[PDB]
């Protein structure tokens, strides 16, 4: 990776038709209206910092039965927006985290009446020694995790 690792590109299916790339060097990558966010997406519906993606070192206890990747890094999508975001098929409320597998489509905002729909396609171009870039490691079937003060602190420095 020369600078880019993950590519979040607001696809045509979404009200936004732009492409943003999370530099492997920037952790965590903040997205939202405010330019402060590593990613620039301004939607009156979402907060200046609707959500941010944070990368963490993927690990596990033993390798009994299951075959892990020793100890590589994975990308976690953190949502801090009050309008709640949607990752593929999992709910993302203000204060949640989710595993990002190469080719992850995340919905920042969806309005049935307003027809306001946002969605970015995550595409890992470079693999900075990733357990498997992001194919959806077994064990945990796409489940939404919760964030702690550690996560909230990340945005505090934003």
């Amino acid at each position: 990776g020369n600078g880019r690792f993950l590519t979040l590109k607001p696809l045509p299916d979404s009200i936004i038709q732009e492409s943003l790339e999370i530099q492997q060097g920037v952790n965590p990558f903040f997205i939202g209206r405010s330019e402060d966010c590593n990613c620039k997406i301004e939607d009156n519906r979402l907060s200046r910092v609707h959500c941010f993606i944070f990368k963490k070192r993927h690990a596990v206890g033993k390798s009994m039965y299951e075959s892990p990747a020793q100890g590589l890094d994975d990308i976690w999508y953190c949502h801090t927006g009050t309008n709640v975001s949607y990752l593929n098929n999992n709910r993302m409320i203000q204060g949640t985290k989710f595993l990002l597998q190469d080719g992850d489509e995340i919905k920042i905002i969806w309005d049935k009446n307003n027809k306001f729909v946002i969605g970015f396609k995550v595409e890992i171009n470079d693999t900075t020694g990733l357990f498997n870039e992001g194919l959806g490691m077994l064990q945990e079937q796409r489940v939404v995790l919760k964030q702690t003060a550690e996560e909230k602190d990340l945005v505090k420095k934003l």
Partner: peptide, 7 residues
């Protein structure tokens, strides 16, 4: 300082 609710 925010009042959002997409329902």
């Amino acid at each position: 300082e925010d009042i959002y609710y997409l329902d």
